[PDB]
Write a protein that binds this ligand. Structure first.
Ligand SMILES: Cc1ccc(-c2nc3c(C)cccc3c(=O)[nH]2)cc1
Ligand SMILES: [Zn+2]
Length: 208
Protein backbone atom coordinates (compact mmCIF):
# COMPACT_ATOMS: atom_id res chain seq x y z
CA UNK A 1 0.00 0.00 0.00
CA UNK A 2 3.02 2.36 -0.09
CA UNK A 3 3.53 4.94 -2.81
CA UNK A 4 6.52 7.30 -3.03
CA UNK A 5 5.99 10.82 -4.28
CA UNK A 6 9.01 12.76 -5.53
CA UNK A 7 9.36 16.26 -4.17
CA UNK A 8 10.63 18.98 -6.45
CA UNK A 9 13.76 20.83 -5.28
CA UNK A 10 11.70 24.01 -5.75
CA UNK A 11 9.18 22.78 -3.16
CA UNK A 12 9.47 24.44 0.29
CA UNK A 13 9.02 20.97 1.78
CA UNK A 14 12.08 19.60 -0.10
CA UNK A 15 14.10 22.60 1.02
CA UNK A 16 13.18 22.37 4.71
CA UNK A 17 13.95 18.60 4.81
CA UNK A 18 17.29 19.15 3.02
CA UNK A 19 18.18 21.94 5.48
CA UNK A 20 17.53 19.63 8.45
CA UNK A 21 19.72 16.97 6.83
CA UNK A 22 22.65 19.30 6.07
CA UNK A 23 22.55 21.42 9.26
CA UNK A 24 22.71 18.44 11.65
CA UNK A 25 25.99 16.98 10.33
CA UNK A 26 28.70 16.81 13.00
CA UNK A 27 32.13 15.24 13.49
CA UNK A 28 32.10 11.82 15.13
CA UNK A 29 34.48 10.39 17.73
CA UNK A 30 35.42 7.51 15.44
CA UNK A 31 37.10 9.93 13.01
CA UNK A 32 34.72 8.69 10.28
CA UNK A 33 35.26 4.97 10.74
CA UNK A 34 31.58 3.94 10.68
CA UNK A 35 29.95 6.56 8.45
CA UNK A 36 32.71 8.08 6.35
CA UNK A 37 34.60 11.37 6.24
CA UNK A 38 32.38 14.30 5.19
CA UNK A 39 30.98 17.70 6.21
CA UNK A 40 27.93 17.75 3.91
CA UNK A 41 25.81 15.66 1.52
CA UNK A 42 24.80 15.69 -2.12
CA UNK A 43 21.02 15.24 -1.86
CA UNK A 44 19.86 13.26 -4.89
CA UNK A 45 16.13 12.77 -4.17
CA UNK A 46 13.55 13.33 -1.44
CA UNK A 47 10.37 11.26 -1.58
CA UNK A 48 7.24 11.49 0.55
CA UNK A 49 6.17 8.07 1.90
CA UNK A 50 2.41 7.56 1.60
CA UNK A 51 0.72 4.58 3.21
CA UNK A 52 -2.76 4.97 4.67
CA UNK A 53 -2.71 1.85 6.84
CA UNK A 54 0.72 2.68 8.36
CA UNK A 55 -0.34 6.29 8.98
CA UNK A 56 -3.51 5.20 10.74
CA UNK A 57 -1.50 2.77 12.88
CA UNK A 58 0.77 5.70 13.85
CA UNK A 59 -2.06 8.18 14.67
CA UNK A 60 -3.95 5.56 16.71
CA UNK A 61 -0.88 5.01 18.92
CA UNK A 62 -0.17 8.75 19.05
CA UNK A 63 -3.67 9.33 20.48
CA UNK A 64 -3.13 6.63 23.13
CA UNK A 65 0.14 8.21 24.22
CA UNK A 66 -1.30 11.76 24.17
CA UNK A 67 -4.16 10.67 26.42
CA UNK A 68 -1.66 9.19 28.92
CA UNK A 69 0.42 12.42 28.93
CA UNK A 70 -1.90 15.41 29.40
CA UNK A 71 -2.82 15.61 25.70
CA UNK A 72 0.82 15.85 24.66
CA UNK A 73 2.30 13.34 22.19
CA UNK A 74 5.73 15.05 22.29
CA UNK A 75 6.15 14.43 18.59
CA UNK A 76 9.55 15.01 16.94
CA UNK A 77 10.98 14.69 13.41
CA UNK A 78 14.09 12.47 13.67
CA UNK A 79 16.47 10.56 11.41
CA UNK A 80 16.69 6.79 11.07
CA UNK A 81 19.46 4.89 9.23
CA UNK A 82 19.19 1.16 8.57
CA UNK A 83 19.95 -1.50 6.04
CA UNK A 84 16.20 -2.30 6.24
CA UNK A 85 14.79 1.04 4.94
CA UNK A 86 13.09 -0.76 2.04
CA UNK A 87 11.21 -3.09 4.40
CA UNK A 88 10.35 -0.22 6.72
CA UNK A 89 8.67 1.97 4.11
CA UNK A 90 6.49 -0.95 2.92
CA UNK A 91 5.62 -2.75 6.17
CA UNK A 92 6.34 -0.20 8.92
CA UNK A 93 8.64 -0.26 11.91
CA UNK A 94 8.54 -3.41 14.05
CA UNK A 95 10.71 -5.56 16.38
CA UNK A 96 12.87 -6.70 13.42
CA UNK A 97 14.17 -3.10 13.11
CA UNK A 98 15.30 -2.97 16.73
CA UNK A 99 18.92 -2.59 17.77
CA UNK A 100 19.20 -5.53 20.15
CA UNK A 101 22.64 -4.41 21.38
CA UNK A 102 21.92 -0.69 21.79
CA UNK A 103 23.05 1.23 24.88
CA UNK A 104 19.42 1.73 25.96
CA UNK A 105 18.27 -1.80 25.31
CA UNK A 106 16.51 -3.50 22.44
CA UNK A 107 14.44 -0.78 20.83
CA UNK A 108 14.23 1.31 17.67
CA UNK A 109 16.78 4.11 17.64
CA UNK A 110 16.48 7.60 16.14
CA UNK A 111 18.88 10.58 15.97
CA UNK A 112 18.76 14.40 15.83
CA UNK A 113 22.12 14.35 13.97
CA UNK A 114 21.64 13.02 10.43
CA UNK A 115 25.34 12.05 10.52
CA UNK A 116 24.62 9.73 13.47
CA UNK A 117 21.91 7.90 11.45
CA UNK A 118 24.38 7.82 8.52
CA UNK A 119 26.69 5.55 10.60
CA UNK A 120 24.00 2.83 10.47
CA UNK A 121 23.00 2.87 6.77
CA UNK A 122 25.31 -0.07 5.99
CA UNK A 123 24.72 -1.84 9.32
CA UNK A 124 25.86 -1.57 12.94
CA UNK A 125 29.18 0.30 13.00
CA UNK A 126 28.89 0.80 9.23
CA UNK A 127 29.06 -2.98 8.64
CA UNK A 128 31.47 -3.64 5.77
CA UNK A 129 30.51 -0.44 3.95
CA UNK A 130 28.80 -0.13 0.59
CA UNK A 131 27.79 -3.41 -1.17
CA UNK A 132 29.77 -2.57 -4.32
CA UNK A 133 33.16 -1.30 -3.04
CA UNK A 134 33.11 -2.45 0.63
CA UNK A 135 33.89 1.13 1.61
CA UNK A 136 32.28 2.72 4.70
CA UNK A 137 33.43 6.12 3.32
CA UNK A 138 32.22 5.49 -0.26
CA UNK A 139 31.59 8.76 -2.14
CA UNK A 140 30.10 7.01 -5.19
CA UNK A 141 27.32 4.76 -3.92
CA UNK A 142 23.78 6.07 -3.16
CA UNK A 143 22.71 5.98 0.47
CA UNK A 144 19.23 6.33 1.94
CA UNK A 145 18.00 7.66 5.31
CA UNK A 146 14.48 8.08 6.69
CA UNK A 147 13.22 11.35 8.21
CA UNK A 148 10.50 10.12 10.55
CA UNK A 149 7.64 11.42 12.67
CA UNK A 150 8.16 9.97 16.15
CA UNK A 151 5.96 10.01 19.25
CA UNK A 152 8.07 10.25 22.43
CA UNK A 153 5.37 10.87 25.01
CA UNK A 154 6.88 10.88 28.48
CA UNK A 155 10.55 10.23 27.83
CA UNK A 156 12.99 8.75 30.35
CA UNK A 157 16.14 10.91 30.50
CA UNK A 158 19.42 9.02 30.48
CA UNK A 159 22.56 11.12 30.86
CA UNK A 160 25.40 9.32 28.97
CA UNK A 161 28.86 9.48 27.41
CA UNK A 162 11.96 -5.78 21.84
CA UNK A 163 12.39 -4.53 25.44
CA UNK A 164 9.78 -2.47 27.32
CA UNK A 165 9.81 1.28 27.97
CA UNK A 166 10.75 2.13 31.53
CA UNK A 167 7.63 2.00 33.77
CA UNK A 168 5.55 5.18 33.43
CA UNK A 169 7.39 6.22 30.21
CA UNK A 170 6.84 5.89 26.43
CA UNK A 171 10.44 6.30 25.22
CA UNK A 172 14.05 6.90 26.33
CA UNK A 173 16.17 10.01 25.59
CA UNK A 174 19.93 9.55 25.37
CA UNK A 175 21.39 12.91 26.40
CA UNK A 176 25.02 13.45 25.47
CA UNK A 177 27.14 14.10 28.69
CA UNK A 178 30.75 14.37 27.30
CA UNK A 179 30.70 15.54 23.69
CA UNK A 180 29.40 19.05 23.88
CA UNK A 181 28.50 19.14 20.17
CA UNK A 182 26.42 15.93 19.95
CA UNK A 183 22.63 16.11 19.70
CA UNK A 184 20.30 13.66 21.42
CA UNK A 185 19.32 10.14 20.41
CA UNK A 186 15.93 8.55 21.21
CA UNK A 187 14.57 5.03 21.59
CA UNK A 188 11.03 3.74 21.22
CA UNK A 189 9.85 0.21 22.06
CA UNK A 190 6.71 0.08 19.90
CA UNK A 191 6.95 0.26 16.10
CA UNK A 192 3.62 2.10 15.93
CA UNK A 193 5.26 5.15 17.59
CA UNK A 194 7.05 6.16 14.36
CA UNK A 195 6.01 6.88 10.80
CA UNK A 196 8.65 6.88 8.01
CA UNK A 197 7.60 10.16 6.38
CA UNK A 198 10.48 11.00 4.04
CA UNK A 199 12.90 8.80 2.13
CA UNK A 200 16.10 10.73 1.41
CA UNK A 201 18.58 9.48 -1.24
CA UNK A 202 22.06 11.00 -1.03
CA UNK A 203 25.82 10.72 -1.27
CA UNK A 204 28.34 11.86 1.31
CA UNK A 205 30.73 14.48 -0.17
CA UNK A 206 34.52 14.24 0.05
CA UNK A 207 35.85 17.39 1.80
CA UNK A 208 38.08 19.65 -0.32
C1 LIG B 1 19.73 -2.85 13.06
C2 LIG B 1 19.85 -1.47 13.33
C3 LIG B 1 20.54 -1.05 14.47
C4 LIG B 1 20.67 0.31 14.78
C5 LIG B 1 20.14 1.30 13.94
C6 LIG B 1 20.26 2.68 14.29
N1 LIG B 1 20.81 3.05 15.49
C7 LIG B 1 20.89 4.36 15.86
C8 LIG B 1 21.46 4.66 17.11
C9 LIG B 1 21.95 3.64 17.97
C10 LIG B 1 21.54 6.00 17.53
C11 LIG B 1 21.07 7.01 16.70
C12 LIG B 1 20.50 6.71 15.44
C13 LIG B 1 20.39 5.39 15.03
C14 LIG B 1 19.85 5.06 13.80
O1 LIG B 1 19.44 5.90 13.00
N2 LIG B 1 19.76 3.70 13.45
C15 LIG B 1 19.44 0.85 12.79
C16 LIG B 1 19.30 -0.50 12.49
ZN1 LIG C 1 30.51 2.15 -3.08
Amino acid sequence: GTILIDLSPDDKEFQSVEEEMQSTVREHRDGGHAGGIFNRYNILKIQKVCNKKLWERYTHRRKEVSEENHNHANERMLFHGSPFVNAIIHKGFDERHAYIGGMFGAGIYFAENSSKSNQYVYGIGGGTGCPVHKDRSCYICHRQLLFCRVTLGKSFLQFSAMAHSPPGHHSVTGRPSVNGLALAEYVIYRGEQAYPEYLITYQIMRPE
